[PDB]
């Protein structure tokens, strides 16, 4: 998440974004929505590939809505949601992928902003009824929750659903990474463009598109370096319910104009350019690392570290990145750049603070303000100069993380950054002499990952048998759940800004006290705390994957039970597929809710299979692949020079 980074992309690179043209049903006069005819031609001009969904990024919405009134229940919620969906694919008419993505347990790092978003949901709706002195908990959409079992069932259903009745399914094979499969949403769908682009068939043309609102799909999706790539996403600015593409492919144009630099000793290479751009906005904030106080994006911070980047590019030898690796040697330019002018932005802001008015104890402006902030922010000694440099060094080993996080796969999924606040530029000294070592980590189980994000007051979604190490004030980990805790607007405006004062989980403390208890689960319970799979859904219709599936495991004469895909039978997906066991296909389709408000199909022409993506030693390659055609330019002559022009200042 990057707040306003999309406001600014979208004000600073126009041409990025471009109306969803979405096909709208008939009503019948009796009242009768006709369905739109989704295997006609796609109204927005081309034809969409793979279609992945933030599945997340529809729950929400349609669980506790802000614009029309609440559903009266998690089946009606799940109608919503099915609706919603819906909608989604009649517009963006996928023709050979469509994944669903489900938040599964993530890495430390999510895990602590996770913590943070649900610690806040919990003292807004207790402040929200002490000032009217059961609801729907929103933090009910998180992994392992009973709500996510629900959720689960649904969208198998929907799924199977649409196979059998929308004829524009018959091809189109759907992957369901539901909550019991580990890896954030965003991250389990990059992994899998990761895992199809090092496939050996693939079509290096694929269009893709990726929905949500998450500011960080559009630096996923500039990381795939596929450059047919949009973002669908709700118009969120409209006023004066429609979507909105950013096309990434116009992204990368405007970040051709805005980082070409003349004259370097070495060859230019745009796509290691947008390496280094992503890296670069780290450094305004992100889930994993919180922004620098001289760089705010409002403040035009990219623009910032942009004109950084370009001073020293000549001098570093080389680009800050490659595939997901950082040169911390060559970062130092970076950081070493903007310390000189860290003194100067702070008296700019001060300076347009005075000018909107014609309490603040750090006075940025003020000489001495870095012995404030680390005694009044950090609360720790101002003469240990040390300890600034200590979180300097944890800050750039947060940046080597979230790199290749973001184009190689969790490296770490127990680290993370253990502080509030970030360092200043000045602090971060001697860069080149870290030497970084992550080691993968253990996952998080279900249980484990819910007493580390969920707050007391949503114990309702944890099994009883902890409650009781969240509420007794004689629980051995109690520091960790504490029912009032400080906000610290940190000079914003806005209450959800800010930061969230909360101590951080030592994890080994937590898992030995879930241990201690753990043999008074329930049988359903061990059950619910295990690692789920993906799974692919087909149609009896599509041609080539459905004969050979049936082949090697429902056949007569069934071979081994998993085998490898070969992407000319399948629709291009590359990996294997393992037969589900208990699992007897064509079956009945039976609707999961109580009130039967969807139909049975009592010939379930779907069939399930388990997924597994293919895993490739070759890493995952910042380049242009072989055969890729790029898309007609959008910016003009026109377009170009005034980036330029502007680049400049
Ligand atoms: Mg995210
Ligand atoms: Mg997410």
């Keep these: 998440?990057?707040?306003?980074?999309?406001?600014?992309?979208?004000?600073?690179?126009?041409?990025?974004?471009?109306?969803?043209?979405?096909?709208?049903?008939?009503?019948?006069?009796?009242?009768?929505?006709?369905?739109?005819?989704?295997?006609?031609?796609?109204?927005?001009?081309?034809?969409?590939?793979?279609?992945?969904?933030?599945?997340?990024?529809?729950?929400?919405?349609?669980?506790?809505?802000?614009?029309?009134?609440?559903?009266?229940?998690?089946?009606?919620?799940?109608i919503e949601i099915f609706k919603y969906t819906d909608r989604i694919v009649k517009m963006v008419r996928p023709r050979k992928i469509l994944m669903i993505a489900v938040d599964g347990v993530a890495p430390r790092a999510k895990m602590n902003q996770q913590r943070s978003r649900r610690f806040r949901a919990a003292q807004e709706a207790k402040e929200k009824e002490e000032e009217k002195k059961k609801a729907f908990d929103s933090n009910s959409i998180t992994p392992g929750t009973?709500?996510?079992?629900?959720?689960?069932?649904?969208?198998?259903?929907?799924?199977?659903?649409?196979?059998?009745?929308?004829?524009?399914?018959?091809?189109?094979?759907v992957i369901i990474s539901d909550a019991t499969v580990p890896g954030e949403g965003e991250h389990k769908i990059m992994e899998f463009i990761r895992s199809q682009r090092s496939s050996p068939e693939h079509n290096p043309n694929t269009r893709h598109v990726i929905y949500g609102l998450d500011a960080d799909l559009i630096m996923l999706g500039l990381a795939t370096h596929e450059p047919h790539f949009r973002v669908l996403r709700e118009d969120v600015f409209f006023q004066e319910k429609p979507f909105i593409w950013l096309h990434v492919s116009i992204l990368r144009e405007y970040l051709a104009a805005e980082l070409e630099v003349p004259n370097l000793p070495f060859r230019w290479d745009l796509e290691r350019a947008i390496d280094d751009w992503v890296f670069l906005c780290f450094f305004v904030g992100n889930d994993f690392l919180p922004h620098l106080p001289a760089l705010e994006i409002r403040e035009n911070g990219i623009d910032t570290l942009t004109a950084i980047w370009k001073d020293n590019l000549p001098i570093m030898g080389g680009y800050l990145?490659?595939?997901?690796?950082?040169?911390?040697?060559?970062?130092?330019?970076?950081?070493?750049?903007?310390?000189?002018?860290?003194?100067?932005?702070?008296?700019?802001?001060?300076?347009?603070?005075?000018?909107?008015?014609?309490?603040?104890?750090?006075?940025?402006w003020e000489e001495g303000y870095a012995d404030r902030y680390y005694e009044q922010k950090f609360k720790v000694d101002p003469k240990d100069i040390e300890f600034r440099h200590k979180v300097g060094r944890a800050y750039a080993e947060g940046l080597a993380w979230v790199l290749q996080y973001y184009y190689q796969g969790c490296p770490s999924w127990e680290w993370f950054y253990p502080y509030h606040y970030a360092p200043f530029a000045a602090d971060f000294v001697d860069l080149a002499k870290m030497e970084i070592k992550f080691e993968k980590g253990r996952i998080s189980r279900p249980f484990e990952q819910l007493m580390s994000v969920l707050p007391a007051?949503?114990?309702?979604?944890?099994?009883?048998?902890?409650?009781?190490?969240?509420?007794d004030p004689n629980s051995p980990i109690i520091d960790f759940y504490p029912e009032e805790f400080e906000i610290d607007l940190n000079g914003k405006k806005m209450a959800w800004q800010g930061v969230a004062l909360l101590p951080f989980i030592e994890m080994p403390r937590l898992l030995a006290a879930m241990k201690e208890r753990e043999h008074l689960l329930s049988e359903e319970d061990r059950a619910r705390n295990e690692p789920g799979f993906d799974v692919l859904l087909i149609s009896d219709a599509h041609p080539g994957l459905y004969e050979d599936i049936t082949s090697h495991f429902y056949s007569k004469k069934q071979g081994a039970p998993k085998?490898?895909?070969?992407?000319?039978?399948?629709?291009?997906?590359?990996?294997?597929?393992?037969?589900?066991?208990?699992?007897?296909?064509?079956?009945?389709?039976?609707?999961?809710?109580?009130?039967?408000?969807?139909?049975?199909?009592?010939?379930?022409?779907?069939?399930?299979?388990?997924?597994?993506?293919?895993?490739?030693?070759?890493?995952?390659?910042?380049?242009?692949?072989?055969?890729?055609?790029?898309?007609?330019?959008?910016?003009?002559?026109?377009?170009?020079?005034?980036?330029?022009?502007?680049?400049?200042n």
């Design 321 to 364: 990145t490659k595939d997901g690796h950082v040169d911390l040697e060559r970062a130092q330019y970076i950081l070493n750049g903007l310390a000189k002018q860290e003194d100067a932005i702070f008296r700019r802001r001060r300076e347009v603070e005075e000018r909107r008015e014609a309490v603040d104890t750090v006075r940025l």
């Design 457 to 471: 007051a949503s114990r309702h979604a944890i099994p009883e048998v902890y409650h009781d190490l969240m509420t």
């Design 563 to 648: 085998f490898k895909l070969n992407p000319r039978r399948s629709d291009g997906l590359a990996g294997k597929v393992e037969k589900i066991e208990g699992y007897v296909p064509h079956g009945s389709l039976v609707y999961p809710l109580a009130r039967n408000s969807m139909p049975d199909v009592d010939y379930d022409r779907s069939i399930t299979v388990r997924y597994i993506m293919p895993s490739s030693a070759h890493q995952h390659k910042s380049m242009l692949l072989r055969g890729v055609k790029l898309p007609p330019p959008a910016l003009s002559r026109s377009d170009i020079e005034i980036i330029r022009s502007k680049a400049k």
């Design 1 to 78: 998440g990057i707040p306003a980074a999309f406001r600014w992309l979208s004000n600073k690179y126009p041409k990025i974004i471009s109306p969803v043209v979405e096909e709208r049903p008939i009503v019948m006069p009796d009242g009768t929505e006709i369905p739109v005819d989704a295997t006609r031609p796609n109204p927005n001009g081309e034809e969409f590939d793979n279609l992945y969904l933030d599945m997340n990024g529809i729950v929400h919405p349609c669980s506790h809505p802000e614009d029309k009134p609440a559903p009266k229940d998690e089946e009606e919620m799940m």
């Design 146 to 173: 009973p709500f996510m079992d629900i959720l689960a069932a649904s969208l198998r259903y929907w799924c199977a659903y649409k196979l059998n009745t929308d004829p524009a399914w018959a091809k189109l094979k």
